[PDB]
RNA sequence: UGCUUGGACUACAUAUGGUUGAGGGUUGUA
RNA sequence: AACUCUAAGCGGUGGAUCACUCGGCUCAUGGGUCGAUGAAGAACGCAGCAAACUGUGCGUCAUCGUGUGAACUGCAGGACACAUGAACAUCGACAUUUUGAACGCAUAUCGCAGUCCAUGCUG
RNA sequence: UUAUAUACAACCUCAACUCAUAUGGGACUACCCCCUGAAUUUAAGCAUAUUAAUUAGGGGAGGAAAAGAAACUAACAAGGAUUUUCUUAGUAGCGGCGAGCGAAAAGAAAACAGUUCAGCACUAAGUCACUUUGUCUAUAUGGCAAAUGUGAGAUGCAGUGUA
RNA sequence: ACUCCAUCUAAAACUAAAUAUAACCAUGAGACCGAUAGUAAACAAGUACCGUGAGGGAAAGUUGAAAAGAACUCUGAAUAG
RNA sequence: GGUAUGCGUAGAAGUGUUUGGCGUAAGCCUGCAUGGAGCUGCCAUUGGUACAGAUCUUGGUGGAUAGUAGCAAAUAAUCGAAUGAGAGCCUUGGAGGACUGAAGUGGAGAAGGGUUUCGUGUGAACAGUGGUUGAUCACGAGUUAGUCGGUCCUAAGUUCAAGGCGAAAGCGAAAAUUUUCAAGUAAAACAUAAUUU
């Protein structure tokens, strides 16, 4: 453990950590679109969002 | 057209099945093009293709692929949708443009059988025995 | 209230037995193929055979449920309500009712506010109907099935049925008394008002 | 024999130690219905083939 | 002479132990395994063999991974976090 | 065989037994679907619980001249003819669906 | 779900041939499966009891729609 | 009853008893404290250590006794108590085991952790009376 | 260099980039 | 008395019956969990006394953390260092042999190497 | 600068690399997508038909998939993505018009959500990917800048916009 | 064929919900079966065994509340009486 | 599903039975015997609802015959001793008469086997007689390589860079085309040189 924790801080602020320091989770969620990258927004999508906010009404008689 | 690959020796059984040399595939030749690409380049997703030229023993095409792990395509919110997993091998499941041709999907009347979603899921649901609880 | 029993539709048929067929001095059922496992030849596939599939195996699409006509439910609830008075027909369900002071017995609305079960057997004492739910204590027994393996290890008989109108605390107050059960006037289940 | 592989002497090593009686003590464990060793092969009676 | 006479001349194995099955099934001369196909990169199961499919399927072995993986999910695929004493 | 009975046409020649649907979870899809409406009506707002507005009358054919196809549209002239706010109507919940080519005054 | 004592099998059990005959046993399908053959060995059964089977009277309306004849009635 | 995640099955409640592991077999082996102890601690019942003095009350022995326990044989759901014996044919006295539902704890072996059980178990007998 | 024992690497297909290149392919300046 | 036939008693053979049941069959509900970072599967090893089953990888019937708070139990030994923790659960730290997905080349060859670093003897 | 007499610089086409970084090949099987496709049977024979556009299939995915925002219905006082259930309906139609098969529009309900390109005009590449130097924090297949460091990119990337 | 009318915009791309579910995780049930039944398998069951192979494939539950599982004596060469 | 304020360790189910009756019958009640924990009458509604047969299924058992057919090829043993509870064996050792008869009933290896090997013990089982013996059972042991083999070479053949083909999986592939599709060399410049398909 002392060898493995000591290898992690020598590998901080470096891109390309070694494979066995790279957060195993699955293979299926490892290949798929890092949660920033799913939420990239085309300028059509971040212009039609900011114009018309969804309002909070009550159509009640 | 596709010659049924029967062993020289018959398609046995009834004469209805006895046909060897006028059979035609239910798939295209364009769809058969994209397959033999996308089979072979297992780590690149297919987008479409187009005819480019032909001569008389070889119709031949031009397939568009997309690596889905290059960052310039992962960053790209206009092309990003093919990076999802639900598009793995998206034409071995029939789903390009030139794959959806041979299924038969459309609307309405003329494409009625088959309207269950695809084409096989219609005969599942046409033939479905509903054994209701309160007969 | 009745869910499906049905045997496994692969029970019977995952042997691979072909009728080792005449003339081998032994009869003609499908016999098991192997040799060496002593399940050979030994009789497969038929209901006469050990291991073989039952005569018609029980499926899930047997009609378990039903639709009664809904006037016939109301003209079955009506006859049950009308016979919950008339103490000749309460007393012929057992039902010790010879202490009660009225039929059909009506208590005030204040009893819906009762909240602890001690103050319910105080209440069912005073209206002389405790002797019925003391009879439900007498016939707590064990079933004589197959219930006793299959999670019905008994009932007792039934007791009264407090038809309230608004549960102020009443339904929680009458839970743990054995035999009694309460109901609300809008619902009025028949299977309560004529058990059996 | 006399001319066997390494893989075949290793598998015939293992099938020589699985060929044992039950230890005399595990007959006495609480709820131990191990009567005999059940899968004791025997050189001329059952071969191996497997 | 089709009988006990001929059955004595049988002393050369048609099949050896496989690598991904470890079973006397590797036909040497085909260089193929009758039960899994050693040089096939794919497992050799069929749908008309329902019994044989479940004699060598997921779960019959030790699933060194598809057992702990099943547990990591109940805890939400956490990792790198270690516990602390209860307070 | 025998008798005066009604020529049969039961369509049971096609290995039908593998097409059978149970319906034993009729009740806990009614319970599923209801607990979702409760879930969704609370996860909106004071906003209406159904709730779009759903226009029409005049279901098509000669049988139903009157009993509605259930109104998808509100067909932008009816928005423009009514003080809104065609893009805006969608943000309230008026259900603006721009495929109907309103054929009557 | 059907009261079986009134079913015959509670009663025919067990006399031997279960109501179906010693001579002319209950065999599998001794006449044809289904409407075979209402034009040879069932023809008498098919005319009487259904005169009008086996032909074509005619005017084909490919895709009848049941609104062009709706017209409910009242006297 | 009323909880939906709570089984009422005899097929289930005996498997999830007779295969309960060796640290939940602690809970299932609980013994009633004597009526003096409910004054001294206000806890109804407590699981047993190896060395809590105990008094059999139900059984052929049935007790009026300073019995210490020698072992709580958890795989037999039983306890052996330090007089409660029986002769073999040789005459070597062996233990007769008693299920700790039918024993009675007289003096608990107080250490630091068992005491904080009686702090855990002695507030909740109060706060179930303030409802 | 001679041997021993340890480690690390070396499969194919591919995408972008890097690096050396190839061509009576196509031009350009000498 | 032989022997035979008939019955009950008694004794044997035999395992029906009944009574049980940590197992099945069916129905329903909450879920989404996935391998080139080597999966699924296979082989072989591992305990003081173990064959299998279960568990597991030279750290090998385990396992850091953490919860719980005196055991395991067929015997033996240790432990009881509970106050700085038994055994069990849990599991996020580490680890995970030969294989298959050997990723150098390959076989009914424990076969044969190429380059690189290090340890040792060369020297 | 091209008799194949040398070199330079481009570009195109194409190589090689134990180059730096990445993907790819699971195996499961109930559901799902695309293929490919019998015969037993039934017709009281049998050959089209029937089984069945189905067993065997057999390549490819997900927690659902496929579908899906009209080259649709309809003929009305008009409807309006897809999917699912009820009904239409065992109906129109198909069929040695034999055995047999066999849908949809409308209605009712569940749930409801819309949209993006390419392409004239949009009139300063306004564009992306790494690359090293800081900064921002984190196990960020990051952000802010910087050199405008390569490279991509007019054989066109971006903004605006869509039947 | 000929005159109009009605209706949509092919040959490019996404998209939740309702829906499906003999597999996988984790649960609750039942007019089910009760050891020749129910899974083949209630147990060291895909085990033992058989086949070159593909493949095939069993039998097998119950001492008592507690082992208190019969010390000791005699006879025997002895398990045993 | 209701009911009998049913029955039950003061003995339930089941089982036996020259207990005693009831019924026209199917059946049923009851005593005693054994047994040791559950069970019934009635009103509904139901079912995997009644067996003598099916060369029925699965387990058990009879006659034959419980001791009958039979344990007869490969010439053959006999003495005395030691064992031992018991010896025709093989148990052994001494005499011994014989057989195989060098193309052996001899001594070793291949394939196959998989510990049978070899010591010390030994009861049942097995050794179609016995058994003190055993290829059995129990427990301890045992296979040593630079030189003997593999390993190294290539044969028939597997055919195996996809140039190709096929919807795929995959391929009755002496490929015959796949830029260098080469195996290559301490070799000079301005892709090391005649070269290897």
TrEMBL record, chain A:
Would you say which domain of life the source belongs to?
Answer: Eukaryota
Q: Signal sequence: where?
A: none
To which protein family does this belong? Belongs to the universal ribosomal protein uL29 family.
Name the record gives this protein: Large ribosomal subunit protein uL29
Species source reads Drosophila melanogaster (Fruit fly)
The gene it comes from is RpL35
Parent-protein start and end of this portion: 63 to 123 of 123
UniProtKB/TrEMBL annotation, chain H:
* Keyword Protein biosynthesis found: no
The species this protein was found in: Drosophila melanogaster (Fruit fly)
- Return one GO MF term: RNA binding
Similarity field: Belongs to the universal ribosomal protein uL24 family.
Give the protein's recorded name. GEO07453p1
User: Entry's InterPro entries?
Assistant: KOW (IPR005824), Rib_uL2_dom2 (IPR014722), Ribosomal_uL24_CS (IPR005825), Ribosomal_uL24_euk/arc (IPR005756), Ribosomal_uL24_KOW (IPR041988), Translation_prot_SH3-like_sf (IPR008991)
Occurrences of domain KOW (ranges): 51-82
Q: Where is the composition biased (Basic residues)?
A: 9-21
**UniProt keyword annotation of Electron transport present:** no
Q: Return the PROSITE patterns for the record.
A: RIBOSOMAL_L24 (PS01108)
Could you tell me the keywords of this UniProt record? Ribonucleoprotein, Ribosomal protein
Ranges for the region named Disordered are 1-21
Q: Name one GO cellular component term.
A: cytosolic ribosome
Q: Name one GO biological process term.
A: ribosomal large subunit biogenesis
């Amino acid at each position: 453990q002392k060898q493995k924790e000591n290898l992690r801080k020598v590998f901080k602020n470096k891109k390309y950590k070694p494979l066995d320091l790279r957060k195993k989770k699955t293979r299926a969620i490892r290949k798929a679109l890092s949660p920033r990258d799913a939420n990239r927004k085309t300028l059509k999508e971040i212009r039609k969002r900011s114009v018309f906010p969804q309002r909070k009404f009550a159509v009640k008689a | 057209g596709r010659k049924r690959p029967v062993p020289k020796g018959c398609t046995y059984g009834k004469p209805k099945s006895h046909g060897v040399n006028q059979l035609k595939p239910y798939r295209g030749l364009q769809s058969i093009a994209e397959e033999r690409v996308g089979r072979r380049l297992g780590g690149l997703r297919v987008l479409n293709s187009y005819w480019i030229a032909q001569d008389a023993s070889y119709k031949y095409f031009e397939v568009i692929l997309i690596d889905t792990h290059h960052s310039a395509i992962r960053r790209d919110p206009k092309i990003n949708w093919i990076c999802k997993h639900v598009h793995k091998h998206r034409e071995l499941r029939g789903l390009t443009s030139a794959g959806k041709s041979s299924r038969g999907i459309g609307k309405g009347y003329r494409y009625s059988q088959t309207i269950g979603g695809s084409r096989r899921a219609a005969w599942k649901r046409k033939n479905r025995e509903h054994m209701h609880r309160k007969r | 209230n009745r869910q499906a029993y049905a045997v496994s539709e692969l029970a019977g048929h995952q042997t691979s037995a072909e009728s080792w067929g005449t003339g081998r001095a032994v009869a003609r059922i499908p016999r098991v193929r192997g040799g060496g496992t002593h399940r050979s030849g030994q009789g497969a596939f038929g209901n006469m055979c050990r291991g073989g599939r039952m005569f018609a195996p029980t499926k899930t699409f047997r009609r378990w449920h039903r639709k009664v006509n809904v006037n016939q439910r109301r003209y079955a609830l009506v006859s049950a309500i009308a016979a919950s008075g008339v103490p000749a027909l309460v007393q012929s369900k057992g039902h010790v009712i010879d202490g009660v002071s009225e039929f059909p017995l009506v208590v005030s609305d204040e009893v819906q506010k009762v909240q602890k079960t001690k103050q319910a057997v105080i209440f069912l004492r005073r209206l002389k109907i405790w002797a019925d739910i003391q009879k439900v204590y007498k016939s707590q027994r064990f079933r004589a099935g197959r219930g006793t393996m299959r999670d019905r290890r008994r009932i007792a008989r039934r007791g009264p049925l407090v038809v309230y109108d608004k549960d102020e605390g009443l339904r929680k107050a009458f839970r743990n008394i054995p035999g009694i059960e309460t109901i609300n006037v809008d619902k009025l289940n028949l299977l309560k008002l004529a058990p059996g | 024999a006399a001319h066997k592989s390494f893989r075949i002497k290793q598998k015939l090593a293992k099938k020589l130690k699985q060929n044992r009686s039950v230890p005399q003590w595990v007959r006495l464990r609480t709820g131990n219905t191990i009567r005999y060793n059940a899968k004791r092969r025997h050189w001329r009676r059952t071969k191996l083939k497997l | 002479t089709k009988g006990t006479t001929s059955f004595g001349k049988r002393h050369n194995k048609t099949h050896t132990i496989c690598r991904r099955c470890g079973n006397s099934s590797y036909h040497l001369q085909k260089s193929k395994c009758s039960q899994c196909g050693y040089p096939a990169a794919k497992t050799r199961s069929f749908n008309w063999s329902r019994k044989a499919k479940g004699r060598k399927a997921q779960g019959t072995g030790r699933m060194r991974y598809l057992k702990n993986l099943r547990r990591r999910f109940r805890n939400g695929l956490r990792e790198g976090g270690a516990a602390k004493k209860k307070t | 065989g025998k008798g005066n009975n009604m020529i049969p046409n039961q369509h049971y020649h096609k290995w039908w037994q593998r097409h059978v649907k149970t319906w034993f979870n009729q009740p806990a899809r009614k319970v599923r679907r209801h607990a979702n409406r409760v879930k969704k009506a609370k996860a909106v707002f004071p906003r209406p619980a159904s709730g779009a507005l759903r226009p029409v009358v005049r279901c098509p054919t000669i049988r139903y001249h009157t009993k509605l196809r259930a109104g998808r549209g509100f067909t932008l002239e009816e928005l423009k003819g009514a003080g809104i706010g065609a893009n805006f109507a969608k943000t309230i919940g008026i259900a603006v669906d721009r495929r109907r080519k309103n054929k009557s005054l | 779900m059907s009261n079986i004592k009134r079913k015959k099998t509670r009663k025919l059990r067990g006399h031997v041939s279960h109501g179906h005959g010693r001579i002319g046993k209950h065999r599998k399908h001794p006449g044809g499966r289904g409407n075979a053959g209402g034009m040879h060995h069932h023809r008498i059964n098919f005319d009487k009891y259904h005169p009008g089977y086996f032909g074509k009277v005619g005017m084909r309306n490919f895709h009848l729609r049941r609104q062009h004849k709706f017209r409910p009635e009242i006297n | 009853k009323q909880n939906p995640f709570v089984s009422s099955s005899r097929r289930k409640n005996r498997k999830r008893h007779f295969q309960a592991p060796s640290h939940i077999r602690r809970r299932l082996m609980s013994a009633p404290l004597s009526k003096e102890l409910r004054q001294k601690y206000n806890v109804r019942s407590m699981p047993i250590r190896r060395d809590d003095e105990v008094q059999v009350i139900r059984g052929h022995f049935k007790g009026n006794q300073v019995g210490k326990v020698v072992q709580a044989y958890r795989k037999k759901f039983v306890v052996y108590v330090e007089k409660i014996q029986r002769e073999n044919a040789n005459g070597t006295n062996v233990y007769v085991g008693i299920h700790p539902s039918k024993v009675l704890i007289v003096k608990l072996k107080l250490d630091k952790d068992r005491k904080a059980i009686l702090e855990r178990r002695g507030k909740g007998r109060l706060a179930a009376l303030g409802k």
